[PDB]
C-alpha cells in the first residue's frame, strides 16, 4: 500500500487494541538506539562538571551561610556539602553506566534520581535543555538501549544483538518532534514575527555571507526570525519522510551548528545533532560498519543480523510487558502534548508571560531589561524606615520577574532581618522592567507589604501590575528619538499608573537633565523648594541636579514621559584628558594627579586590548583547552576530598587547608 510505504504502518493495525499492541511491539533493529544511548551518556558525562555545577558546589552550598533559596516545594532542603558531593558522584557514575551500557537500568535510575532532585531544588536554574535532559533520561530508563553495542551484551548472551520494540523509536521521535513543533508555534508571537526579539543577532560575523545580498535590517527580519520559525515548523515533517530527509538533515545540522556558536547553551545543540539520526533507518550504523576493512571490523560491534528477543511480538498473544509499553507510549506523548499549554490550572505562576520558565519550549522569545530595583522596610516596633541593597542574600536575579519567588524572598528576609535588630519588618518592592523595547514600568504594586500579601499556586496574583500593551505602537517613535540623539546624551522612557508617583534623586554628575511629557498629564514637585508645576503634551522642564523631585501621575490613564540627561562630569574629564594627550603628543611630535593616572590607565587598557585582539588562533584554542582542563581537575579533587571526609573522617584543619590549596592550583 502507498500508506504502508509512506507511514510505515496501515490503517488496519489501528482496528483493535490487540492489533495496536502488536504493531507497537514489532521487532526492530537496535543499532541507532545504541548509538544515541552512547552519545547521550557521553554528553551528560561532559556536562556534569560544567553546567550542572559540580565545579562550584563548595561556593554554592557553603556550610553555615545565610542564603535565600527558591525550591519548588518550600519543604525541600539541601544536604550538607559532603553529601552534595556524594549525590553528584552517584549522578556521574549513573551517566557513565548509561554511556557504556553496563548495568543499564540501575545506571539509568542512579542518574535519574539525583538529577531530578537537583533540578527541583532550584527554580532559578530551570531552562529548556535541562528539562529535556531529564525527560530523555526518564524515557531511556524503560527502553532496551543496551541490546546492540554495550558491555551488558558481553556479560549476557541473551542481550547481544537482539531486537527491540518499535515504540522505543516511536517515543524518542515523538519527543523530538514535539520539541521542534512547540518551539515553532511559540515563535508565532507578534514580537517574533515583527522582528523585535533578537534584533541585533544579525551583526555576528557568521552572517557575513548573507550580507553580500541583503541589508542588515532585511537580514535580521528574514533570515533570523522567519527562517527560525520555518525550521521549527517544518523540521519534524522534513525528517520523518524519506524523500526529504537529506535536505532536512542538511538544514537541521546547519541550524544547530550555527546555534552552538551564536549562544552559550551548554550541550543543547550537540544533543539535538545527535538526536537527528534517530529518524533514519534503524540499521544505519550496521550498514556503515558493513563498509569497513576486515581488520578494522574486529574492533567494531557485530555486523550480523539481530537475534529474536522476548521484548518483541512475532507473527502469539501479547503479554503484560507489551501492553504496558503501548500504554506508556500513548500516555506519555499525550501528557507531553498537554503540559506546555496547562497554564490555566496553575494560575499563581503567571506574571507577564505564562508559567515558570523551562517546560514550554519558548526559546529566545522574550527579552527583559531592568532599570532599577528598590527594597524598603519598616520596623514593626520602632517604625523607622530603611533600605536594603538589592539582592543582598541571593545567588540569582530571577526573583525580580516572578511573584512566587518574590514571596519566598520576602519570607526569607523577614526571618533573617531580626538578627540585625529589625523586628517584625514590613517589606515593599519597587522594580522597573521593560520587555522587547517597551516602556519601562512597574511589575509589582509598590504599596503592598509582600510579607503579609496572599499567594496561592492556583489563584491569580492580585499585586501584579498588568502589562501596558496599548503602548506597544510607540516603539517606532521611541527608536526614532533614540537614534536622533547626540553621542553624549542618553534617554529613559517611563510609563506610570494613575495614583502613583516616582521619587527620583538626580546625581550631581548628571548636570543638564530634563523631562518631557509624551502622553497624559503629570505634576512635577521640587521637594527642596516645595513647588508644584503641571506639564502638558510636549512640554519639557529642566530639573535640578543633586536634589529630589517627584512625578505624580494625575491623568485617569497611564502617562508616558522620557528623561534626557548628559553626564557633565564625564564630558569635562574626557575633554581635559584629550587635550592633555594631544599636548603631550604634539611635544613628542616636535612642536612645543588622578588625570594622569586615568590617562595612563586608559593607554594601559588599550594596549592590553590590542594584544588581546592580535592573538594567534592556536594560542586562544590552547588556553581554551587549559581552562576546560582546570575545571575538570578541580572538580575531581574537590569530590575526592569530600568523599574522604565522609568515609575516613575529618582531618586536621591545616591538612584540609593544604588540600584545598592543592585543589585550587591551576593546571600545568
Amino acid at each position: 500500500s502507498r500508506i504502508g510505504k509512506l507511514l510505515g504502518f496501515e490503517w488496519t493495525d489501528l482496528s483493535s487494541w490487540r492489533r495496536l499492541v502488536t504493531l507497537l511491539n514489532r521487532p526492530t533493529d537496535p543499532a541507532s538506539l545504541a548509538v544515541f544511548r552512547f552519545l547521550f551518556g557521553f554528553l551528560m558525562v561532559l556536562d556534569i562538571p560544567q553546567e550542572r555545577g559540580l565545579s562550584s558546589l563548595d561556593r554554592k552550598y557553603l556550610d553555615g551561610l545565610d542564603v535565600c533559596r527558591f525550591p519548588l516545594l518550600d519543604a525541600l532542603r539541601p544536604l550538607p556539602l559532603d553529601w552534595m558531593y556524594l549525590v553528584y558522584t552517584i549522578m556521574f557514575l549513573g551517566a557513565l553506566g548509561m554511556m557504556l551500557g553496563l548495568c543499564y537500568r540501575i545506571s539509568c535510575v542512579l542518574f535519574l534520581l539525583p538529577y531530578w532532585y537537583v533540578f527541583l531544588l532550584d527554580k532559578t536554574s530551570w531552562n529548556n535543555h535541562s528539562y529535556l535532559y531529564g525527560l530523555l533520561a526518564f524515557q531511556l530508563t524503560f527502553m532496551d538501549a543496551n541490546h546492540y553495542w554495550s558491555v551488558d551484551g558481553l556479560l549476557n548472551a541473551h542481550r547481544r544483538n537482539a531486537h527491540v520494540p518499535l515504540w522505543n523509536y516511536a517515543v524518542l521521535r515523538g519527543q523530538i518532534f514535539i520539541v521542534y513543533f512547540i518551539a515553532g508555534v511559540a515563535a508565532l508571537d507578534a514580537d517574533w514575527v515583527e522582528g523585535y526579539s533578537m534584533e541585533y543577532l544579525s551583526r555576528h560575523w557568521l552572517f557575513s555571507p548573507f550580507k553580500l545580498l541583503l541589508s542588515e535590517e532585511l537580514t535580521s527580519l528574514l533570515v533570523v526570525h522567519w527562517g527560525g520559525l520555518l525550521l521549527d515548523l517544518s523540521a519534524g515533517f522534513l525528517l520523518f519522510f524519506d524523500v526529504s530527509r537529506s535536505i532536512g538533515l542538511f538544514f537541521v545540522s546547519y541550524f544547530h551548528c550555527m546555534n552552538s556558536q551564536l549562544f552559550s547553551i551548554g550541550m543543547f545543540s550537540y544533543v539535538m545533532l545527535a538526536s537527528s539520526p534517530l529518524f533514519c533507518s534503524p540499521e544505519w550504523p550496521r550498514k556503515l560498519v558493513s563498509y569497513c576493512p576486515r581488520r578494522l571490523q574486529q574492533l567494531l560491534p557485530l555486523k550480523a543480523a539481530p537475534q529474536p528477543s522476548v521484548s518483541c511480538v512475532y507473527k502469539q498473544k501479547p503479554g503484560l510487558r507489551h501492553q504496558l509499553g503501548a500504554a506508556f507510549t500513548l500516555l506519555y506523548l499525550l501528557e507531553q502534548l498537554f503540559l506546555p499549554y496547562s497554564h490555566f490550572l496553575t494560575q499563581g505562576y503567571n506574571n507577564w508571560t505564562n508559567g515558570l520558565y523551562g517546560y514550554s519550549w519558548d526559546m529566545m522569545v522574550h527579552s527583559r531589561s531592568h532599570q532599577h530595583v528598590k527594597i524598603t522596610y519598616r520596623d514593626g516596633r520602632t517604625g523607622e524606615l530603611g533600605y536594603l541593597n538589592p539582592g543582598v542574600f541571593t545567588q540569582s536575579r530571577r526573583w525580580k520577574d516572578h511573584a512566587d519567588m518574590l514571596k519566598q524572598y520576602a519570607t526569607c528576609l523577614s526571618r533573617l532581618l531580626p538578627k540585625y535588630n529589625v523586628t517584625e519588618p514590613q517589606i515593599y518592592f519597587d522594580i522597573w522592567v521593560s520587555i522587547n523595547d517597551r516602556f519601562q514600568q512597574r511589575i509589582f504594586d509598590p504599596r503592598v507589604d509582600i510579607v503579609q500579601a496572599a499567594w496561592s499556586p492556583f489563584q491569580r496574583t492580585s499585586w501584579v501590575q498588568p502589562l501596558l500593551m496599548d503602548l506597544s505602537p510607540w516603539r517606532a517613535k521611541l527608536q526614532e528619538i533614540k537614534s536622533s540623539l547626540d553621542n553624549h546624551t542618553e534617554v529613559v522612557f517611563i510609563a506610570d499608573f494613575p495614583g502613583l508617583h516616582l521619587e527620583n534623586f538626580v546625581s550631581e554628575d548628571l548636570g543638564n537633565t530634563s523631562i518631557q511629557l509624551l502622553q497624559g498629564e503629570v505634576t512635577v514637585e521640587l521637594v527642596a523648594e516645595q513647588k508644584n508645576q503641571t506639564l502638558r503634551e510636549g512640554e519639557k522642564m529642566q530639573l535640578p541636579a543633586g536634589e529630589y523631585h517627584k512625578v505624580y501621575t494625575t491623568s485617569p490613564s497611564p502617562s508616558c514621559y522620557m528623561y534626557v540627561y548628559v553626564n557633565t562630569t564625564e564630558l569635562a574629564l574626557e575633554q581635559d584628558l584629550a587635550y592633555l594627550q594631544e599636548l603631550k603628543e604634539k611635544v613628542e611630535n616636535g612642536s612645543e594627579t588622578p588625570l594622569v593616572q586615568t590617562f595612563l590607565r586608559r593607554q594601559q587598557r588599550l594596549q592590553e586590548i590590542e594584544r588581546r585582539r592580535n592573538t594567534p588562533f592556536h594560542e586562544r584554542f590552547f588556553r581554551f583547552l587549559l581552562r576546560k582542563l582546570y575545571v575538570f581537575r578541580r572538580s575531581f579533587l574537590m569530590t575526592c576530598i569530600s568523599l574522604r571526609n565522609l568515609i575516613l573522617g575529618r582531618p586536621s584543619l591545616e591538612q584540609l587547608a593544604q588540600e584545598v590549596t592543592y585543589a585550587n592550583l591551576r593546571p600545568f
Partner: peptide, 27 residues
C-alpha cells in the same frame, strides 16, 4: 546590607540594560 535614601532613589544610575535570555546559562 543597608544603604542610604539617596542611593535607593537613584533611578538614573549609570546604565542598566541586558539581553537577559533565560535560556542562556548566565554563570
Amino acid at each position: 546590607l543597608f544603604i542610604r535614601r539617596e542611593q535607593a532613589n537613584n533611578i538614573l544610575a549609570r546604565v542598566t540594560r541586558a539581553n537577559s535570555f533565560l535560556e542562556e546559562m548566565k554563570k
